[PDB]
């Protein structure tokens, strides 16, 4: 029987949505079915944030960042533990998790 | 107040209403409560009509007075802004208070320790203490509720349009209900004002 109300998708009122790959599995999942994720992290890992600054010939040199957008599939997102199975009543709550610390 | 000039709103009571702020509702409106509204100003706050408010107190005070046994009214608050205002309303009137936590089954489970059977329920905030409301609908209880603009009118019977968020505006509404119940009864009447100050009914923050 119908487990989701939007069929696990965001298609509401169009016929076809374009297919994109997966980043890991490379599986053609449609665009509103891919688990999406935007990462904003520093390009050098935070252990080497002191030693990049001592070797800086510039003063107060800013740290550039990585901006990639990740479209995981449905199968390999739950394998990679980026998304999980929830309860039948937690399934209806589509609010983002509390990342702000 | 059926066009009776003895029961009409006087000049001092409106000063009390405006000093406490009972006329200032929330930032939403239930569709049941659009009858009691005057208008929405800027910054969203609905202005509760006060000739409508004074007629719902005097309807509710007739309801409380028309009960013979004064200890059959059951007076309930769960938020702490109306927990002093209820023990002092029930002290001067004669009613039975449940201030604090209403454990469910108080009106249904006849085996329980805290079982009682009221003839009329007065609650303070139908959003908050809904559990005495839905439990009234098993045992045939009419219901007054001191209602805000965004507070839903299911199972209430005569809901007074007040501002039940501010601590002064709750205590003043309980004070007015106590005053009108005592005045419409046989006790000390409409000439001299009530010597019980309305600041007795307010909420004391540490």
């Amino acid at each position: 029987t119908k487990k989701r109300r939007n069929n696990g998708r965001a298609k509401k009122g169009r016929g076809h949505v374009q297919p994109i790959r997966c980043t890991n599995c490379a599986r053609c999942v449609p665009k509103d079915k891919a688990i999406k994720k935007f990462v904003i992290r520093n390009i050098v890992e935070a252990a080497a944030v002191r030693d990049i600054s001592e070797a800086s010939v510039f003063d107060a040199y800013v740290l550039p960042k990585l901006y990639v957008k990740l479209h995981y599939c449905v199968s390999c997102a739950i394998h990679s533990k980026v998304v999980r199975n929830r309860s039948r009543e937690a399934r209806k709550d589509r609010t983002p998790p509390p990342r702000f610390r | 107040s059926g066009a009776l000039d003895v029961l009409q709103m006087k000049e001092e009571d409106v000063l009390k209403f405006l000093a406490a702020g009972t006329h200032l509702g929330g930032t939403n409106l239930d569709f049941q409560m659009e009858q009691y509204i005057y208008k929405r100003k800027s910054d969203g706050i609905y202005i509760i009509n006060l000739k409508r408010t004074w007629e719902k107190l005097l309807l509710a005070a007739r309801a409380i007075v028309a009960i013979e046994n004064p200890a059959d009214v059951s007076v309930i608050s769960s938020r702490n802004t109306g927990q002093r205002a209820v023990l002092k309303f029930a002290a001067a009137t004669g009613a039975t208070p449940i201030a604090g936590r209403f454990t469910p089954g108080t009106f249904t489970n006849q085996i329980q320790a805290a079982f009682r059977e009221p003839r009329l329920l007065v609650v303070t905030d139908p959003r908050a203490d809904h559990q005495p409301l839905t439990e009234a609908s098993y045992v045939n209880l009419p219901t007054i509720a001191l209602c805000n603009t965004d507070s839903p009118l299911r199972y209430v019977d005569i809901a007074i349009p007040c501002n039940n968020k501010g601590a002064h505006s709750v205590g003043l509404m309980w004070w007015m209900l106590a005053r009108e119940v005592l005045r419409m009864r046989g006790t000390i009447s409409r000439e001299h004002p009530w010597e019980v100050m309305p600041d007795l009914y307010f909420y004391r923050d540490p």
Binding site: - | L15, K16, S42, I47, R84, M197, P198, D199, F202, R204
Partner: protein
């Protein structure tokens, strides 16, 4: 670990609630009065009631506790609740109304009220939270 079961805590709560005048802070004189008040099957339970009582009497100086109710606090809360000020907080000579509130009072024929001091209304219609 060392958690006290419902027997120790229930017995300690009733023996605080009934005999608060005799109990103090010393565990030893608490034990000497907990074996004269109550009939406890003996010592290894008697010293556990008297130890939670000695931990529970120190908890009463710092305020009320959410279980038991003793009549040295519940007279002080009673005299704290029957407290009226001298001049009430609703006796303000200058009370502030909006423009539109004065119109409602004029509908209720209270435009002749003298204490009302109408404020300047807010210039912007900005009250909703910034969604997104």
């Amino acid at each position: 670990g060392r958690v006290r079961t419902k027997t120790v805590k229930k017995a300690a709560r009733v023996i605080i609630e009934k005999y608060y005048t005799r109990l103090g802070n010393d565990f030893h004189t608490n034990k000497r009065v907990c074996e004269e008040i109550a009939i406890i099957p003996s010592k290894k339970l008697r010293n556990k009631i008297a130890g939670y009582v000695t931990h529970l009497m120190k908890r009463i100086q710092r305020g009320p506790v959410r279980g038991i109710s003793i009549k040295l606090q519940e007279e002080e809360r009673e005299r704290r609740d029957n407290y009226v000020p001298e001049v009430s907080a609703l006796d303000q000579e200058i009370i502030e109304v909006d423009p539109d509130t004065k119109e409602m009072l004029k509908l209720l024929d209270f435009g002749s009220l003298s204490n009302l001091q109408v404020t300047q209304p807010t210039v912007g219609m900005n009250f909703k939270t910034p969604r997104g």
